[PDB]
């Protein structure tokens, strides 16, 4: 075993690997959304950039799990990064609904990891999860829900003017 | 009697206490409106913040009446702060209509106090009311009426796009 | 259920509401202490201001629980804010003893919430409590105990000179 | 009559003259207190300076009534400035008690003037009194009461150490 390893479950090590993959998967989904909104026949650039920035932050979160793995004396084991579920994302509302789901799926996996860490008696891991993942997740989920509520208020999917306005007012101008 | 007390009616003292309570009540109502607009299924954050700021200013007004009471040699007597009338506020229009009412109710109580102070021959109190409460009240009431007129113009309650736009343009961006 | 809601107990939601109320209650108690010490026949202004600042920080803590509630997809439910236990607070020693009790009561409720969150398996809530409430509570309680010890050393309640000196040296000059 | 005179009672004019004299009288009393506390066998210099500053502000208030008189088209009529009641002021407590009385006497005369102005229907005078005299009076009276309470707490008249400490902590260091 690694000379650094202490109080670090095989089970925890494997779960960190799975989480690293899920973050890469989430990043790739968001990249796809970026590319969709950047199409000439979609053309909602602030929306596009929102998703591009989400992609980057999920990739950074993946990197943090690689660093964590090594700090604990586990071994990073990579798997294929699955392509996103969809090739095209419909409109801002559908994309945000998919993002909410994705964030919930990522959160569930993080909470699952936290439960394992709790059962395993792994306090450093629990703290890591709380500090670096769980709060920022809650905020993300809140933000996306807020957005969904606004998109519905604006009359999506039918109301194109409403969609236009969301891109100008709700998301940062890029 | 307090060594500082001069020209200060029991009636005035009691009325200042009642006003202190009413300001706390108004503050708490506005807090509730803040919380409503911050819900994920409401999500009008600039509106939310407008009400949060109104809550803070009403609490400061309460504090000013405590200071006044003591400066005159009366005694602050606190009562329960009643919870707001509603748990949920409908939409921006309904909330602003409730705010107009509340501000009118607070103003009526302030004008009632001013009349008592006038009848009692209490000039320092009259001046305090004029200087610190009555003008800022008139302005508040004007502002909220203006807002109601705009919300009606925007097609509330039905027009969600209009509601969206009010939150972006009429209230300060938070 | 709210579209944002995930891993958030009815029990947790209700407990957050109760805590929001308790913080408002604590704020109101401290306001009363401020007003007492500001009386012309009490006149310990730095003491007064200590309590005024405690009142403000408890109100901010209430606001943080409203924000939390909404971030998780629970619903803020407000109740009356009960008036404080006493209308008058005796002297600096009695007031600080009451403050210690109040802080202990608030801490017990926070620890009770943490236990529920723990039993419920709610890690984000546990972290919130630790980060935003429990440490700052411990410090508050320590500070007030320190003060009580000093007030006893100074000869309170009988030693008015000692009380005078506490207001000049122990609490920040306002 | 003066070419400027409008809505200005003989009664108001005379009352302004009386008030001008009373302010000069109050100034002179405070001067005497300054001189007392500056004696080598009293030697409470911050106390002394407090009273010196009160003397100056009462003289400025006298000057403001001269300016007012002329602005309205009345005529300043001066009378002797009576010497203070006492040649020696005992100690800080006795002096502050005398100051409270004096401030109350000045306030009563100001309130009496305000009543006359009210009965006479003289709104500019009423406003002047409110704005320049009545609030600053209330504050003065509050401050002195606060001080009296502290001096009693400190054990005056007997407790010389308490008197010493008041001069260092309660009044501005000069
Ligand atoms: Cl597809
Ligand atoms: Cl309701
Ligand atoms: Cl009591
Ligand atoms: Cl004498
Ligand atoms: Mg080795
Ligand atoms: Mg496949
Ligand atoms: Mg495949
Ligand atoms: Mg994440
Ligand atoms: Mg984030
Ligand atoms: Mg996220
Ligand atoms: Mg008394
Ligand atoms: Mg009721
Ligand atoms: Mg009720
Ligand atoms: Mg007001
Ligand atoms: Mg205002
Ligand atoms: Mg108002
Ligand atoms: Mg829904
Ligand atoms: Mg009760
Ligand atoms: Mg009760
Ligand atoms: Mg823990
Ligand atoms: Mg707290
Ligand atoms: Mg604290
Ligand atoms: Mg505390
Ligand atoms: Mg002429
Ligand atoms: Mg004589
Ligand atoms: Mg004589
Ligand atoms: Mg004066
Ligand atoms: Mg003054
Ligand atoms: Mg004065």
Coordinates of N, CA, C and O in Angstrom, one line a residue, chain C residues 16-132:
Chain C
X16 N -35.6 24.2 10.6 CA -35.0 25.5 10.1 C -35.9 26.7 10.4 O -35.5 27.7 10.8
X17 N -37.2 26.5 10.1 CA -38.2 27.5 10.5 C -38.2 27.9 12.0 O -38.4 29.0 12.4
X18 N -38.1 26.8 12.8 CA -38.1 27.1 14.3 C -36.9 27.8 14.7 O -36.9 28.8 15.5
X19 N -35.7 27.5 14.1 CA -34.5 28.2 14.4 C -34.5 29.6 13.9 O -33.9 30.6 14.6
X20 N -35.1 29.9 12.8 CA -35.3 31.2 12.2 C -36.1 32.1 13.3 O -35.6 33.2 13.7
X21 N -37.2 31.5 13.8 CA -37.9 32.2 14.8 C -37.1 32.5 16.1 O -37.2 33.6 16.6
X22 N -36.4 31.5 16.5 CA -35.5 31.6 17.8 C -34.5 32.7 17.6 O -34.2 33.5 18.5
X23 N -33.9 32.8 16.4 CA -32.9 33.9 16.1 C -33.6 35.3 16.2 O -33.0 36.2 16.7
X24 N -34.8 35.4 15.6 CA -35.5 36.6 15.7 C -35.9 37.0 17.1 O -35.7 38.1 17.6
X25 N -36.3 36.0 17.9 CA -36.5 36.1 19.3 C -35.3 36.6 20.1 O -35.4 37.6 20.9
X26 N -34.1 36.0 19.8 CA -32.9 36.4 20.5 C -32.6 37.9 20.1 O -32.1 38.7 20.9
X27 N -32.7 38.2 18.8 CA -32.4 39.5 18.4 C -33.2 40.6 19.1 O -32.8 41.6 19.5
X28 N -34.5 40.2 19.3 CA -35.5 41.1 20.0 C -35.1 41.3 21.5 O -35.2 42.5 22.0
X29 N -34.7 40.2 22.1 CA -34.2 40.3 23.5 C -33.0 41.3 23.6 O -32.9 42.1 24.5
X30 N -32.1 41.1 22.7 CA -30.9 42.0 22.7 C -31.3 43.4 22.5 O -30.7 44.3 23.1
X31 N -32.3 43.7 21.6 CA -32.8 45.0 21.4 C -33.3 45.6 22.7 O -33.1 46.8 23.0
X32 N -34.0 44.8 23.5 CA -34.5 45.3 24.7 C -33.4 45.6 25.7 O -33.5 46.6 26.4
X33 N -32.4 44.8 25.7 CA -31.2 45.2 26.5 C -30.6 46.5 26.1 O -30.2 47.3 27.0
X34 N -30.4 46.6 24.8 CA -29.9 47.9 24.3 C -30.7 49.1 24.9 O -30.2 50.1 25.4
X35 N -32.1 49.0 24.7 CA -32.9 50.1 25.1 C -32.8 50.4 26.6 O -32.9 51.5 27.1
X36 N -32.7 49.3 27.4 CA -32.5 49.4 28.9 C -31.3 50.2 29.2 O -31.3 51.1 30.0
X37 N -30.1 49.8 28.6 CA -28.9 50.4 29.0 C -28.8 51.9 28.5 O -27.9 52.6 29.0
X38 N -29.6 52.2 27.5 CA -29.7 53.5 26.9 C -30.5 54.5 27.8 O -30.6 55.7 27.6
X39 N -31.3 53.9 28.8 CA -32.2 54.8 29.6 C -31.3 55.8 30.4 O -30.2 55.6 30.8
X40 N -31.9 57.0 30.6 CA -31.2 58.0 31.4 C -30.8 57.6 32.8 O -29.9 58.2 33.4
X41 N -31.6 56.7 33.4 CA -31.4 56.2 34.7 C -30.6 54.9 34.8 O -30.5 54.3 35.9
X42 N -30.0 54.5 33.7 CA -29.1 53.4 33.5 C -27.8 53.9 33.0 O -26.7 53.9 33.6
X43 N -27.8 54.3 31.7 CA -26.8 55.2 31.1 C -25.4 54.5 31.1 O -24.4 55.0 31.6
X44 N -25.4 53.3 30.5 CA -24.1 52.5 30.2 C -24.1 52.3 28.7 O -24.5 51.3 28.2
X45 N -23.6 53.3 28.0 CA -23.8 53.3 26.6 C -23.0 52.3 25.8 O -23.4 51.9 24.8
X46 N -21.8 52.0 26.3 CA -21.0 51.0 25.6 C -21.6 49.6 25.8 O -21.6 48.8 24.8
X47 N -22.1 49.3 27.0 CA -22.9 48.1 27.2 C -24.1 48.1 26.3 O -24.5 47.1 25.7
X48 N -24.9 49.2 26.2 CA -26.0 49.3 25.3 C -25.7 49.0 23.9 O -26.3 48.2 23.2
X49 N -24.5 49.5 23.4 CA -24.1 49.2 22.1 C -23.7 47.8 21.8 O -23.9 47.3 20.7
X50 N -23.1 47.2 22.8 CA -22.8 45.8 22.7 C -24.0 45.0 22.4 O -24.0 44.1 21.5
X51 N -25.0 45.2 23.1 CA -26.3 44.5 22.9 C -26.9 44.8 21.6 O -27.5 44.0 20.9
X52 N -26.9 46.1 21.2 CA -27.4 46.5 19.9 C -26.7 45.7 18.8 O -27.4 45.2 17.9
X53 N -25.4 45.7 18.8 CA -24.7 44.9 17.8 C -25.0 43.4 17.8 O -25.2 42.8 16.7
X54 N -25.2 42.8 19.0 CA -25.7 41.4 19.2 C -27.1 41.3 18.5 O -27.3 40.3 17.8
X55 N -27.9 42.2 18.7 CA -29.2 42.2 18.1 C -29.1 42.1 16.6 O -29.8 41.3 15.9
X56 N -28.3 43.0 16.0 CA -28.1 43.0 14.6 C -27.6 41.7 14.0 O -28.0 41.2 13.0
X57 N -26.6 41.1 14.7 CA -26.0 39.9 14.2 C -27.0 38.8 14.3 O -27.1 37.9 13.4
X58 N -27.9 38.7 15.3 CA -28.9 37.6 15.4 C -29.9 37.8 14.3 O -30.4 36.8 13.7
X59 N -30.3 39.0 13.9 CA -31.2 39.3 12.8 C -30.6 38.8 11.5 O -31.2 38.2 10.7
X60 N -29.3 39.0 11.3 CA -28.6 38.6 10.1 C -28.6 37.1 10.1 O -28.8 36.4 9.0
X61 N -28.4 36.4 11.2 CA -28.5 35.0 11.3 C -29.9 34.4 10.9 O -30.0 33.4 10.2
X62 N -30.9 35.1 11.3 CA -32.3 34.8 10.9 C -32.4 34.8 9.4 O -33.0 33.9 8.7
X63 N -31.9 35.9 8.8 CA -31.9 36.1 7.4 C -31.2 35.0 6.7 O -31.6 34.5 5.6
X64 N -30.1 34.5 7.2 CA -29.3 33.4 6.6 C -30.1 32.1 6.6 O -30.1 31.3 5.7
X65 N -30.9 31.9 7.7 CA -31.8 30.7 7.7 C -32.9 30.8 6.6 O -33.3 29.8 6.1
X66 N -33.4 32.0 6.4 CA -34.4 32.2 5.3 C -33.8 31.8 4.0 O -34.4 31.1 3.2
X67 N -32.6 32.3 3.7 CA -31.9 32.1 2.5 C -31.7 30.6 2.3 O -31.8 30.0 1.3
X68 N -31.2 30.0 3.4 CA -30.9 28.5 3.4 C -32.2 27.7 3.1 O -32.1 26.8 2.2
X69 N -33.3 28.0 3.7 CA -34.5 27.4 3.5 C -34.9 27.4 2.0 O -35.2 26.3 1.4
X70 N -34.8 28.5 1.4 CA -35.1 28.6 0.0 C -34.1 27.9 -0.9 O -34.5 27.4 -1.9
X71 N -32.9 28.0 -0.5 CA -31.9 27.3 -1.3 C -32.1 25.8 -1.4 O -31.9 25.2 -2.4
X72 N -32.6 25.2 -0.3 CA -32.9 23.8 -0.2 C -34.3 23.4 -0.8 O -34.6 22.3 -1.0
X73 N -35.1 24.4 -1.1 CA -36.4 24.2 -1.6 C -37.5 24.0 -0.5 O -38.6 23.6 -0.8
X74 N -37.2 24.3 0.7 CA -38.2 24.4 1.7 C -38.9 25.7 1.7 O -38.6 26.6 0.9
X75 N -39.9 25.9 2.5 CA -40.7 27.1 2.5 C -40.6 27.7 3.9 O -40.8 27.1 4.9
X76 N -40.2 29.0 3.8 CA -40.2 29.8 5.1 C -41.6 30.0 5.6 O -42.5 30.4 4.9
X77 N -41.8 29.7 6.9 CA -43.0 29.9 7.5 C -42.7 30.7 8.8 O -42.0 30.2 9.7
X78 N -43.2 31.9 8.9 CA -43.0 32.8 10.0 C -44.0 32.6 11.1 O -45.2 32.3 10.8
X79 N -43.6 32.9 12.3 CA -44.5 32.9 13.5 C -44.2 34.3 14.2 O -43.3 35.0 14.0
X80 N -45.2 34.6 15.1 CA -44.9 35.8 15.9 C -43.6 35.7 16.6 O -43.1 34.7 17.0
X81 N -43.0 36.9 16.8 CA -41.7 37.1 17.5 C -42.2 37.5 18.9 O -42.7 38.6 19.1
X82 N -42.0 36.6 19.8 CA -42.4 36.8 21.2 C -41.5 38.0 21.8 O -40.3 38.0 21.6
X83 N -42.2 38.8 22.6 CA -41.5 39.8 23.3 C -40.5 39.2 24.3 O -40.7 38.1 24.8
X84 N -39.5 40.0 24.7 CA -38.6 39.4 25.7 C -39.2 39.1 27.0 O -40.3 39.7 27.4
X85 N -38.5 38.3 27.8 CA -38.9 37.8 29.2 C -39.2 38.9 30.2 O -39.9 38.7 31.1
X86 N -38.3 39.9 30.1 CA -38.3 41.0 31.0 C -38.4 42.3 30.2 O -38.0 42.4 29.1
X87 N -38.9 43.3 31.0 CA -39.0 44.6 30.5 C -37.8 45.5 30.9 O -37.6 46.6 30.3
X88 N -37.2 45.1 32.0 CA -36.1 45.8 32.5 C -35.0 44.7 33.0 O -35.5 43.6 33.3
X89 N -33.8 45.0 32.9 CA -32.7 44.0 33.0 C -31.8 44.1 34.2 O -30.8 43.5 34.3
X90 N -32.2 45.0 35.2 CA -31.5 45.1 36.4 C -30.2 45.9 36.4 O -30.2 47.0 36.9
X91 N -29.2 45.2 35.8 CA -27.8 45.8 35.8 C -27.0 45.0 34.8 O -27.5 44.0 34.2
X92 N -25.7 45.4 34.6 CA -24.9 44.7 33.6 C -24.7 43.2 33.9 O -24.7 42.4 33.0
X93 N -24.6 42.9 35.2 CA -24.4 41.5 35.5 C -25.7 40.7 35.2 O -25.6 39.6 34.6
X94 N -26.8 41.2 35.7 CA -28.0 40.4 35.4 C -28.3 40.2 33.9 O -28.7 39.2 33.4
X95 N -28.0 41.3 33.1 CA -28.2 41.3 31.7 C -27.2 40.3 31.0 O -27.6 39.5 30.2
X96 N -26.0 40.3 31.5 CA -25.0 39.3 30.9 C -25.4 37.9 31.3 O -25.2 37.0 30.5
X97 N -25.9 37.7 32.5 CA -26.3 36.4 32.9 C -27.5 35.9 32.0 O -27.6 34.7 31.5
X98 N -28.5 36.8 31.7 CA -29.6 36.5 30.8 C -29.1 36.2 29.4 O -29.5 35.3 28.7
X99 N -28.1 37.0 28.9 CA -27.5 36.8 27.6 C -26.8 35.4 27.6 O -26.9 34.7 26.5
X100 N -26.1 35.0 28.6 CA -25.5 33.7 28.6 C -26.5 32.6 28.4 O -26.3 31.7 27.6
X101 N -27.6 32.7 29.2 CA -28.7 31.8 29.1 C -29.3 31.7 27.7 O -29.5 30.6 27.2
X102 N -29.5 32.9 27.2 CA -30.1 33.0 25.8 C -29.2 32.3 24.8 O -29.6 31.6 23.9
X103 N -27.9 32.7 24.9 CA -26.9 32.1 23.9 C -26.9 30.5 24.1 O -26.8 29.8 23.1
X104 N -26.9 30.0 25.3 CA -27.0 28.6 25.6 C -28.2 27.9 25.0 O -28.2 26.8 24.4
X105 N -29.4 28.7 25.1 CA -30.7 28.2 24.6 C -30.6 28.1 23.1 O -31.0 27.1 22.5
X106 N -30.1 29.1 22.5 CA -29.9 29.2 21.0 C -28.9 28.0 20.6 O -29.2 27.3 19.6
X107 N -27.8 27.9 21.3 CA -26.9 26.9 21.0 C -27.5 25.5 21.1 O -27.2 24.6 20.3
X108 N -28.3 25.2 22.2 CA -28.9 23.9 22.4 C -29.8 23.6 21.2 O -29.9 22.5 20.7
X109 N -30.6 24.6 20.7 CA -31.5 24.4 19.5 C -30.7 24.2 18.3 O -31.0 23.3 17.5
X110 N -29.5 24.8 18.1 CA -28.6 24.6 17.0 C -28.1 23.2 17.0 O -28.1 22.5 16.0
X111 N -27.8 22.7 18.2 CA -27.2 21.3 18.4 C -28.2 20.3 18.2 O -28.0 19.2 17.7
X112 N -29.4 20.6 18.6 CA -30.6 19.8 18.4 C -30.8 19.6 16.9 O -31.2 18.5 16.4
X113 N -30.7 20.7 16.2 CA -30.9 20.7 14.7 C -29.8 19.9 14.0 O -30.1 19.1 13.1
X114 N -28.6 20.0 14.6 CA -27.5 19.3 14.0 C -27.6 17.8 14.2 O -27.4 17.0 13.3
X115 N -28.2 17.4 15.4 CA -28.5 16.0 15.7 C -29.6 15.4 14.8 O -29.5 14.3 14.2
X116 N -30.6 16.2 14.5 CA -31.7 15.8 13.6 C -31.1 15.6 12.2 O -31.4 14.6 11.5
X117 N -30.2 16.5 11.8 CA -29.7 16.6 10.5 C -28.8 15.3 10.3 O -28.7 14.7 9.3
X118 N -28.2 15.0 11.5 CA -27.2 13.8 11.5 C -28.0 12.5 11.4 O -27.7 11.6 10.6
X119 N -29.1 12.5 12.1 CA -29.9 11.3 12.2 C -30.6 11.1 10.8 O -30.7 9.9 10.3
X120 N -31.0 12.2 10.2 CA -31.8 12.3 8.9 C -30.8 12.0 7.7 O -31.3 11.7 6.6
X121 N -29.6 12.1 8.0 CA -28.4 12.0 7.0 C -28.5 13.2 6.0 O -28.7 13.1 4.8
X122 N -28.3 14.4 6.6 CA -28.4 15.6 5.9 C -27.1 16.4 6.0 O -26.9 17.4 6.8
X123 N -26.0 16.1 5.2 CA -24.7 16.6 5.4 C -24.4 18.1 5.1 O -23.5 18.8 5.7
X124 N -25.2 18.6 4.1 CA -25.1 20.0 3.7 C -25.6 20.9 4.9 O -25.0 21.9 5.2
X125 N -26.7 20.4 5.6 CA -27.2 21.1 6.7 C -26.3 21.1 7.8 O -26.0 22.1 8.5
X126 N -25.7 19.9 8.1 CA -24.7 19.8 9.2 C -23.6 20.8 8.9 O -23.2 21.5 9.8
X127 N -23.0 20.7 7.7 CA -21.9 21.7 7.4 C -22.3 23.1 7.6 O -21.5 24.0 8.1
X128 N -23.5 23.5 7.1 CA -24.0 24.9 7.3 C -24.0 25.3 8.8 O -23.5 26.4 9.1
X129 N -24.5 24.4 9.6 CA -24.6 24.7 11.0 C -23.3 24.9 11.6 O -23.1 25.8 12.4
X130 N -22.4 24.0 11.2 CA -21.0 24.0 11.8 C -20.2 25.4 11.5 O -19.7 26.1 12.4
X131 N -20.4 25.7 10.2 CA -19.6 26.8 9.5 C -20.1 28.2 9.9 O -19.3 29.0 10.1
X132 N -21.5 28.3 10.0 CA -22.1 29.6 10.1 C -22.6 29.9 11.5 O -22.9 31.1 11.9

